[PDB]
Amino acid sequence: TFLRWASEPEHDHRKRMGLKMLLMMGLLLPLTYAMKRHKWSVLKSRKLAYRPP
């Protein structure tokens, strides 16, 4: 354990970041997806019709 600890004196430090990163990405990915789907809904509902005279 000690050897491991020394090899990566930051092992603990990091995993806390990674936990904060997972929580922030779980918050931010559906919200950015919802924006994208807002601004892309317009087109995704566009109905085209061909009306030759």
């Binding site: 601004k39 317009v42 005279p53």
Partner: protein
Amino acid sequence: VPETQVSILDNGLRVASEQSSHATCTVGVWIDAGSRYETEKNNGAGYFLEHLAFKGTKNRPGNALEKEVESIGAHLNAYSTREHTAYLIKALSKDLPKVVELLADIVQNSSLEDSQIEKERDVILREMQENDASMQNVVFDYLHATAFQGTPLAQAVEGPSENVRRLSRTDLTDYLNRHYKAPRMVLAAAGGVEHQQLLDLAQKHLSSVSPCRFTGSEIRHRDDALPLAHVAIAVEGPGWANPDNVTLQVANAIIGCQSFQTFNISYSDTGLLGAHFVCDAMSIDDMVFFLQGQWMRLCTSATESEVTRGKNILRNALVSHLDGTTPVCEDIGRSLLTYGRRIPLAEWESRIQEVDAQMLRDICSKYFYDQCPAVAGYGPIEQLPDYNRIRSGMF
């Protein structure tokens, strides 16, 4: 200015008049019946009845109607909108006895000759085949449509060719017998008329008469062979009765690429407030930008001088005896149909002079900013920006 005196008869028909010293008169019948009251199975009934209404009534078979109203020397006109129908005549005041009678038969016991029925069907249809030439009307009939979706207001006054071909006397008879009720009718007279004589003539003749939501949207009819592009952008107008309409008219008077007109079309608690402009394709984008800037400009540049300016131009738009009989009648008929009363010009002047810059930018901010627009484009409209872009002035 002489007051507009209103009486009410048995039927419920109102008889409004505004005497003036001009010599001729414009006597008309308004009816609260348009394409908004049609239910997509009779979408051209008002238009086709407006064609059939001058082709003879029992009393005036054949060309009699046109002949007499021609002999008397009067001009016979009719029009139909999405909410109102008007059948008006301008004639020598001494012709009042004649006039009222003729008009009566136009709006009642009108005898639609199926012979004529077929004929008009063809007329309407063929013209429609060419009504496509009126690009502006096209732009304005999809704007209505694109915005007022799933609502009666959408259906155009003309109606779909389909219906035009598929219409019969009985259907017409229905529209006639359904939307021509006496409480929904105004007999308006302007010019050299006496109100008591007109009331007696209305008692003698015509005494027998028996949702909407705005949807942000966009319709881009692309046809690159046309030389010019017409684009209309609108938001939801307050309505006909809403007081803020006046502060919006002043805003339009502030705005006043090419043919950049501005409109405030009002229907019963709804409407379209916006701008229509025709430009070469390459400039469409720029023009769009400009318009948007101006609107936010009202929100930010209501210089008192300009405020006054707009008030003054509005002041010189109000219709009056000077404008003439027809203009006035028309105003009497619309005022009795929409407001239920004739608003005098002094009240209009009071509502204009109470408008200042702060309430103008308040009323504008409520309606232009953060309001999904309805866009209708026709022509070479590839450089016309798409919705996300348009709604996003960002400035």
